[PDB]
């Protein structure tokens, strides 16, 4: 019993935290075999013109209390690769891989190429992420586990004025319609993750909660007219397959969880609480519920 | 900007999780230098829990009975001693990976990590505080029994639970690493239930600094409050008592948004009436009690 806002263990990537310097900017990189990654904002700006002024030994890398040498530079979109000379003995199994909107992934927070914190976030609707970050972040990490292999999806490069932030995959594509430079950006109207809530909802299930269950069911259309009405996502029918293996094991048909939905949406929780929570719980995946009340490791 | 439960980072302790084996049960066990510390209650059956005696139980034993496996090696148990309810296994092999650690006990109030572990393999790494009536809101299966607590201050780990047991309402029980018990809990099957539970009044009183801090000052008000006619209104809402301990405690954080702590707890005794209108505090919509004022100035300030 229980269910916590869980994380994946952050061993294999505190291995490959570094420190990456250049001039007055110090930040965090990603060193995996013998290149570092990191925002290419370590260097309205033209980066082709900044970066062909700077010279291997501008860039200062630390790996612990030991200083690598930098013997090659390039940038790939947003993110700047710093070829070592040293290939990282730490470096584990590893994909870069590009997360969608509902998504959700461990940060390995990290100042000075010092691991310091690890949380789990989701990816918004509207791409940005409601992590916990501080000057000197940037660079900090998003990764998801899979057996032994670490899965790359977010290097952090941002804070926006409402406190939320903004970063790219580690191909240095940016997650949501932001820009690296110091301009008016804004997030958009963000939009509750409706597969993860009815995810959340099934978790409340099997940890014993049955107060919101009802007898009613749904049609998927008009559950979307009224997921609409009340800024949820819209729910198709892949996320009704999604959910079919928590619809096995409660005996509660994805609509009937729908209808539930509904009325919670239309009437509140009247003073009562869904695993320790009065807010509907939408950063938890389909996946996040079967792995954690099944006990997968890595 | 942001505030979120953050643990430590989990990878010093990673490299210290092993299964132990003793007949047919399996648990996690925590290889430390040339000892495993792990449950004395793998030594035990199902038709033993109801009343073990665990010398009797132990001086059956072997070193060859335990099987002990890091990774894919078998350690080989060349000793054993039982300390309270944590049984030591000596081992031939000392832990390469061992970090700087310290064994520390917490008082309740007090947060920490998680690693929760399966068969010496982690799985998930979350955030916690000992409740005030000794147990923690985990998140634990079958099997996670020798799962740890601890806190990374410096490169130190300190080493502050060892998970044992889960009780009837779904909440946790374990002891220290030297196997004391927290709460007047025992390692047996008997009708245990924890105590009534209880808010940690001076964690809500940080975290309401830590909103003060991110921008948020919606709920605070014109008035401030005695110590004493604070508890007697915190009492009737099953909140801990304040005391001047606690007051002590939060002076940095008053200090640095210059709201006083007895002004906070005027604001939290309104908070407590009024409830919050459809409002959140830090993305909250309930009071939260479990980031201490350590938590908050180490998250908010750096
Ligand atoms: C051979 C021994 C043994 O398997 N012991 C573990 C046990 C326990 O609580 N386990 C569990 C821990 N954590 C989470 C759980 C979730 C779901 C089921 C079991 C969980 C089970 C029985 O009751 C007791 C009673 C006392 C003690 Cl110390 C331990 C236990
Ligand atoms: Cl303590």
Same mark, same amino acid.
């Given at each position: 019993?229980?269910?916590?806002?869980?994380?994946?263990?952050?061993?294999?990537?505190?291995?490959?935290?570094?420190?990456?310097?250049?001039?007055?900017?110090?930040?965090?990189?990603?060193?995996?075999?013998?290149?570092?990654?990191?925002?290419?904002?370590?260097?309205?700006?033209?980066?082709?013109?900044?970066?062909?002024?700077?010279?291997?030994?501008?860039?200062?890398?630390?790996?612990?209390?030991?200083?690598?040498?930098?013997?090659?530079?390039?940038?790939?979109?947003?993110?700047?690769?710093?070829?070592?000379?040293?290939?990282?003995? *730490? #470096?584990? *199994?590893?994909?870069?891989?590009?997360?969608?909107?509902?998504?959700?992934?461990?940060?390995?927070?990290?100042?000075?190429?010092?691991?310091?914190?690890?949380?789990? +976030?989701?990816?918004?609707?509207?791409?940005?992420?409601? !992590?916990?970050?501080?000057?000197?972040?940037?660079?900090?990490?998003?990764?998801?586990?899979?057996? @032994?292999?670490?899965?790359? +999806?977010?290097?952090?490069?941002?804070?926006?004025?409402?406190?939320?932030?903004?970063? #790219? @995959?580690?191909? !240095?594509?940016?997650?949501?319609?932001?820009? @690296?430079?110091?301009?008016?950006?804004?997030?958009?109207? %963000?939009?509750?993750?409706?597969?993860?809530?009815?995810?959340?909802?099934?978790?409340?299930?099997?940890?014993?909660?049955?107060?919101?269950?009802?007898?009613?069911?749904?049609?998927?259309?008009?559950?979307?007219?009224?997921?609409?009405?009340?800024?949820?996502?819209?729910?198709?029918?892949?996320?009704? %397959?999604?959910?079919?293996?928590?619809? &096995?094991?409660? !005996?509660? &048909?994805?609509?009937?969880?729908?209808?539930?939905? *509904?009325?919670?949406?239309?009437?509140?929780?009247?003073?009562?609480?869904?695993?320790?929570?009065?807010?509907?719980? %939408?950063?938890? #995946?389909?996946?996040?519920?079967?792995?954690?009340?099944?006990?997968?490791?890595?």
């Amino acid at each position: 019993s229980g269910f916590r806002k869980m994380a994946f263990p952050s061993g294999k990537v505190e291995g490959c935290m570094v420190q990456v310097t250049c001039g007055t900017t110090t930040l965090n990189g990603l060193w995996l075999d013998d290149v570092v990654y990191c925002p290419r904002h370590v260097i309205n700006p033209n980066y082709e013109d900044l970066l062909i002024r700077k010279s291997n030994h501008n860039f200062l890398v630390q790996a612990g209390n030991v200083q690598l040498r930098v013997i090659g530079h390039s940038m790939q979109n947003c993110v700047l690769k710093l070829k070592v000379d040293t290939a990282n003995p *730490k #470096t584990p *199994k590893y994909k870069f891989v590009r997360i969608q909107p509902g998504q959700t992934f461990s940060v390995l927070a990290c100042y000075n190429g010092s691991p310091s914190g690890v949380y789990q +976030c989701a990816m918004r609707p509207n791409f940005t992420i409601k !992590g916990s970050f501080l000057n000197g972040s940037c660079g900090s990490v998003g990764f998801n586990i899979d057996y @032994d292999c670490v899965s790359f +999806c977010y290097m952090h490069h941002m804070e926006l004025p409402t406190g939320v932030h903004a970063g #790219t @995959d580690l191909e !240095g594509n940016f997650y949501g319609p932001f820009v @690296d430079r110091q301009t008016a950006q804004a997030a958009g109207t %963000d939009t509750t993750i409706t597969v993860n809530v009815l995810a959340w909802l099934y978790a409340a299930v099997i940890n014993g909660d049955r107060w919101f269950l009802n007898r009613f069911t749904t049609t998927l259309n008009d559950f979307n007219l009224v997921a609409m009405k009340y800024n949820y996502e819209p729910l198709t029918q892949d996320h009704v %397959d999604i959910l079919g293996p928590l619809s &096995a094991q409660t !005996g509660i &048909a994805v609509l009937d969880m729908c209808a539930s939905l *509904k009325e919670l949406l239309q009437n509140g929780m009247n003073g009562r609480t869904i695993l320790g929570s009065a807010l509907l719980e %939408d950063e938890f #995946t389909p996946f996040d519920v079967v792995r954690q009340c099944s006990g997968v490791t890595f």
